[PDB]
């Protein structure tokens, strides 16, 4: 159903196509243990207190 | 280079080491000093008569325990005051003291003990 190799006046078959999708991992991001804290400024502070 | 962290700083000591002192109409147990140039005072630092800190070998010259935080470049205390003050007469203070390098703590304690200052044991 398509042109052959090395000739234009003959025919050949395509018979589909294979694919190679890379490997992606999502275990840690799927754990959902990180809590989103959206903020406005470009730098956030924090003060640490520890009683003796 | 941002080497990973930014430390904004540590809080300066608060004036809470005074447990008991002879309080009168005026400052019987506290005296005033003229601040020395380019010298930073914190609470709990031992001072000599001239107003400088006690160094190694000068432990017997201990005069008072600073109870205010002074900023050398600003030349004002953290309470907006013009002069540094310290406890020199009879009083009871917490054992927390800030001494310089190579300063004998026991020698400083004995020198302040004779003037009337006692140091209650503090624990943690």
Question: Exposed/middle/buried for B62, CB within 10 Å: 0-12, 13-18, 19+?
Answer: buried
Residues shown for chain A: 52
Phi, psi for B100 (deg, rounded to 5): -80, 180
Specify the residue for token string 């008569």. B49
Distance from C-alpha of B58 to C-alpha of A6, rounded to nearest angstrom: 101
At A3, which helix (H) or strand (E)?
Answer: strand A2-3
Name every residue whose Cβ is closer than 8 Å to that of residue B72 and which is 6 or more positions away in sequence.
B35, B37, B38, B39, B40
10 Å Cβ neighbour count for B52? Answer: 15
Q: Which residue has the tokens 């380019």?
A: B38
User: Which strands form B117-120's sheet, in the order they lie side by side?
Assistant: B18-21, B91-94, B117-120
> Can you list the positions of beta strands (E) in chain B?
18-21, 30-33, 46-47, 64-66, 70-71, 76-77, 84-87, 91-94, 117-120
What kind and span of H or E run contains B114? helix B105-115
- The experimental method is cryo-EM
Contact B39, B85 (CB under 8 A): no
The structure was resolved to a resolution in Å of 3.1
How does strand B117-120 pair with strand A11-12? unpaired
Classified as helix, coil or strand, B98 is strand
Return d(Cα A4, Cα A1) in angstroms, integer: 9
Per-residue DSSP letters for A11-27? EE--------------H
Find residue A12's DSSP bridge partners: A2
The two tokens of residue A32 are 């959902």
Nearest to B21 by CA among B116, B121, B124: B116
C-beta neighbour count of B69 within 10 angstroms? 18
The enclosing H or E element of A2 equals strand A2-3
Positions of E strands within B8-48: 18-21, 30-33, 46-47
Query: Which residues make Cβ contacts (< 8 Å) with residue B96, sequence separation at least 6?
Result: B13, B17, B44, B122
Whole-angstrom distance, CA of residue B70 vs CA of residue B107: 26
- Compute the distance between CA of residue B19 and CA of residue B42 in angstroms, rounded to an integer: 18
């Amino acid at each position: 159903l398509t042109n052959s190799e090395k000739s234009r006046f003959f025919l050949a078959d395509l018979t589909g196509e294979v694919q190679s999708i890379p490997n992606t991992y999502g275990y840690i991001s799927g754990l959902g243990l990180f809590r989103s804290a959206p903020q406005t400024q470009t730098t956030f502070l924090m003060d640490l207190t520890d009683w003796d | 280079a941002y080497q990973g962290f930014t430390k904004l700083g540590e809080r300066e000591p608060l004036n809470d080491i005074i447990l008991w002192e002879e309080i009168t109409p005026t400052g019987h147990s506290r005296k005033e000093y003229a601040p020395v140039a380019s010298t930073e005072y914190r609470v709990g630092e031992v001072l000599k008569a001239d107003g400088s800190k006690v160094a190694a070998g000068q432990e017997a010259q201990a005069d008072s325990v600073c109870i205010v935080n002074f900023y050398a470049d600003l030349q004002l205390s953290y309470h907006g005051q013009l002069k540094v003050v310290g406890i020199y007469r009879d009083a009871e203070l917490k054992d927390l003291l800030k001494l310089e390098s190579g300063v004998d703590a026991a020698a400083v304690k004995s020198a302040l003990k004779a003037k009337g200052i006692d140091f209650v044991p503090t624990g943690l």
